[PDB]
Subunit: 292 residues, 3 copies
């Protein structure tokens, strides 16, 4: 833990010095925006003045790029590039940026998006889901970002997660949907984090629905839990990029079977629907960030 602490310190030391050298007045970001699915182009919405700062991950200790600048009048930090647990990284590596950035002392809000399969039978690809709760499946079984010695200078040994998704931020999001007259459906529901990288089988999706899942994805919950451990408020927004297949597969006894490949999830589909929802998601987040 003591070496993790050193890495986090070194990272903060590097970042804060770049900031004070780059910005005329002290740059104190209010929000970290993990620019996942839907948010690939929101950095273009960063204001020209003051000139934004772009730090490559490669030059930051423990860390793709961080972008520092003003967005709709508000000072933010953007993460373009994230580490997914299915790539083999430890969860400490995944959430290192949150802990490093916490040391700036100004960030109080995490805004994070991701792609997700719709488990709720009412959801359609293209819909969004504002996350109000989650199930951390890997967390229940030992794959937990807080496993190990507690970072006492950050948060408590035992962290409650029944209050993870700030109600006021969710109300802010829906007020901006209405204000912008965005017609895209925004559900409110439970996000289940599963490790991946497989898409769910039919039986797995049926299990997840039975378990109370509205949408399933392969990221975000470790970052949410770590941000909550640091005391941050969290807004999480899922893009429903595909409808999960839940019907039993064709029986060998069926006269006219539905092909088992029919409607199967693909990364191509995820990418295509992420791009379609991108303008709405970026404009929603653009509006929300000003009022934080």
């Amino acid at each position: 833990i003591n070496e993790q602490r050193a890495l986090i310190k070194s990272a903060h030391r590097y970042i804060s010095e770049k900031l004070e050298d780059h910005f005329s007045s002290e740059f104190l970001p209010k929000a970290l925006v993990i620019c996942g699915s839907g948010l690939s182009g929101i950095s273009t919405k960063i204001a020209d003045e003051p000139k934004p700062l772009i730090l490559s991950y490669s030059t930051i200790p423990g860390f793709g790029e961080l972008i520092f600048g003003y967005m709709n009048g508000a000072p933010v930090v953007l993460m373009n590039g994230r580490l997914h647990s299915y790539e083999g990284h430890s969860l400490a590596e995944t959430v290192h940026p949150i802990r490093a950035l916490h040391l700036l002392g100004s960030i109080n809000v995490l805004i994070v998006t991701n792609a997700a399969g719709g488990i709720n039978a009412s959801f359609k690809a293209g819909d969004l889901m504002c996350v109000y709760d989650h199930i951390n499946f890997p967390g229940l079984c030992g794959f937990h970002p807080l496993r190990g010695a507690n970072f006492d200078e950050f948060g408590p040994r035992f962290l409650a997660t029944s209050d993870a998704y700030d109600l006021e931020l969710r109300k802010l999001l829906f007020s901006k949907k209405k204000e912008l007259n965005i017609e895209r459906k925004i559900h409110e529901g439970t996000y289940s984090y599963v490790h991946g990288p497989t898409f769910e089988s039919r039986a797995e999706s049926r299990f997840l629905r039975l378990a109370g899942t509205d949408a399933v994805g392969m990221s975000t919950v470790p970052e949410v839990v770590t941000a909550r451990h640091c005391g941050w408020r969290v807004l999480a927004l899922s893009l429903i990029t595909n409808e999960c297949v839940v019907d039993p597969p064709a029986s060998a006894h069926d006269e006219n079977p539905v092909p088992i490949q029919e409607g199967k999830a693909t990364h191509e589909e995820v990418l295509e629907n992420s791009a379609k929802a991108s303008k709405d998601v970026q404009e929603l987040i653009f509006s929300v960030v000003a009022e934080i």
Copy 2:
């Protein structure tokens, strides 16, 4: 590396056995191991002063990591107490966590594990302050690969494939309820299923709802690896959970609610767990003290 685990178990047992020989006048053959989790932090005081008990710090015993083992007579019965158990969420391997059970099994006399812990109430009828006699468990991490028997089998202790459908001895549970009645303890003792989850987070609302749906009556971050290991060694097991808090299961306030309930309302805290553990300690302590005397 089962070899190196074996070496650790053997050296720990060597150390313990030799200390017992040096300390006690007569041979000391404990019949039970009591793991003193929540509500049992004080039961070491009930160990008889005569003959003088032996205290072994985890720091002085091989393989033990930290915490102490206390060897003595409780209510006329020779026992070993474990104070200061290890937890997986702290980063220890499950091997490290259950190592004490294997080391103590080599004394050849222990045939019962008695374990206590704190648990969140998942069953809607449970209240803070209630107890739950455990009659079944769900080993969630174990199903997924975080399992105390993972690795080469300790064939000198038990079978490669261990049944767990019979983990919680019926006669010991009946004894528990007998003593409850004998002691006139008015505190409720439920009978139910304990689910082991890794922690160290308290469950989200959806997580608790999932646990409830899966058949959980109480949830905690300990005990099941020790139970499974004790069963692999062929011991009987009595497990008792302190319901320290009622898990929040209702959905959080909707952004569309005009009169939303604060999402932090009723949130679990370690402070509440400690406070309720303490309020229950007297009853839990008298209960176990009474049980050990009748095997």
Copy 3:
């Protein structure tokens, strides 16, 4: 680490390939890998004497129990006799290594795999078979996943669908051969749940598995299935129901005439006894199926 796994896979394939070329006078291109789990331990005896089969002990193959290469019912196959179960402490990469090594031969397009399983579906009886047409990979959902790590781009996609994991035509082939062979043994079609083991499930765990949609539970096979699919192979999976899981709640301390909690408990002895009983049928089924893959 993917560097190391790739080196092992390359070295294993080279060793196997060289042995095949020396051993068989004609080029040997197996079309199926048969993982000879429960019910299949004797199927190697149905390998044709001519051409003489090649047996490769695991201890001589890099990264690897024996591999048997030969002709079965006219078809070139490789048999895995010996598998590595995760509960023994092996990584999932080591467990599925043979599939990636053998994929480099460039001819296998089908995995046939058997295993023993506990019946979770209340209608299943010991002695029944279950043709798998879906699974739940509980360990995989929670992080214990054979594709965890950098992706093997040479084999398949970063993100793999598993809603189509159990080939329909192969399942129809299996049931056709059951009919043709006049096998009266029941063959269910349902969902296999993989759990780590090595414990047999508690009553509460089985009850949980049942409500999750499990028909049969076992401690193997799903990581192999997922890996074969990642390689683009078709999969036929067949479980032997070797015991009926204990699911009823245990006796209450308040019961007057409690049912003994030990009654009906699972034992490895029972698993092996029932695997033995079903073995003739399972071998006859797989033998006839490979002729048409």
